[model samples]
Target: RREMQEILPGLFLGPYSSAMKSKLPVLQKHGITHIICIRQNIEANFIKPNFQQLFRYLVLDIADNPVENIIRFFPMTKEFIDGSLQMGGKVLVHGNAGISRSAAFVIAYIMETFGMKYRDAFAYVQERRFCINPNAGFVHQLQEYEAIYLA
Candidate 1:
């Protein structure tokens, strides 16, 4: 069950903004893998049409994703990871600064990846990356992930 946690094995960060587009080339050159663009807004998308040719694969995480959507979209996230793993694709989750929602997803993923508790996992990731700050409401959503896994 994907609720939110430290990023899955093949997952990474993109945050928000087109500024990170420059790194795509570096990712491609190293064969890092398919870039998962979490910014669903055309305005916030990091990929440039001109640079689309640089990578072999690119995908959007979700469209019009509100911070509160986590509870409703947990299943979608699980399916996504399942499908991506099967297809040999990596996932990169990002929001503005790659801190809040991204961290939640990563924390959930980490919990799912192993058998770690949700709060424990969240705490671990938070300890490592203090930047991963999801508000109280967001944290509550992640706790749902923990409940599922803990059960």
Candidate 2:
């Protein structure tokens, strides 16, 4: 089975596993209509060869480090995922290894949409994946985000 763990009802977070990068049947089985592929290096559109014809892609060649400016992308990413769900579609937010970068974005979405604090959102995501770690920079940014958005 694919390892796309659900962060919310229609939002999932995972890595670019072989099953996800190359297997269309696996994606289709999960009804993944939109994909947020997070990459670092400059590549020719991070769309997989097999996924180009079927899925909608929002590719970002951003680093997974603490200083990658992931906060700036929070609004857009949330809107994309929410839009997909509004249309009865599923969204997969994936990074290269399914750790810091992806977790940060998912955590931001949680904090924004659910009105949860940073640690609570982080705890929530960790409860689902068990391996979720959004780098120190991301954690700080999210904390800052919490202050600005909720406090």
Candidate 3:
């Protein structure tokens, strides 16, 4: 059974419940070597014994609100994603319910990694996953990110 959805080729974007870091079968099947967690608890869980050695995990203790500095982590997130993909490792970017925070980061990653516009990148991810609805602040931040990092 497919527990998660792949929004991009090697980039899977899904909810924490749907894509738990402990799902070894799903993780190995997708070749997910890098896991990006936007929740503290989820990251902590993945950092435990068995799961820790399975995939490279990065935890960002971020909230789902519009006030969080989601934009500030764009560069580091993009670098982690780009490096993972370059090394032939599939990546999963997941948050609480996988709608807003995680989606925003994936959108930013798509924009930076592919040099696509914000609207284009967003639409691309939305095309693959219809549940994406980044907060207003995240939307604004991506626009700022586009202006600074994109053409």
- For candidate 1, lDDT tens digit of each residue in 25-105? 545543444444454456453432324554333344443334556665566566676677678766555555666666666
Residues 1-151 of candidate 2 have per-residue lDDT tens digits of 1266988898888877722555678788888899888877653344233377788888877787777787778878888988999999998888866778888888988899998888899999999988888889999988887787765
lDDT of each: 0.56, 0.80, 0.80
lDDT of 2 at 136: 96
- For every candidate structure, what is the RMSD over all alpha carbons to the true structure, in angstroms? 5.7, 2.5, 2.9
What 10-residue stretch in candidate 3 is worst by lDDT? 41-50
Best by TM-score: 2
Structural similarity to truth (TM-score) of each candidate: 0.66, 0.88, 0.87
Candidate 2 residue 91 Cα shift, in angstroms, is 0.3
- Which one is best on lDDT? 3
> For residue 132, what is the lDDT in candidate 3?
87
Question: Deviation in angstroms for 70 in model 1?
Answer: 1.2
Against the correct fold, how does model 2 do in TM-score? 0.88
Clashes of 1: 11
Regions more than 4 Å wrong, model 3: 1-3, 40-50
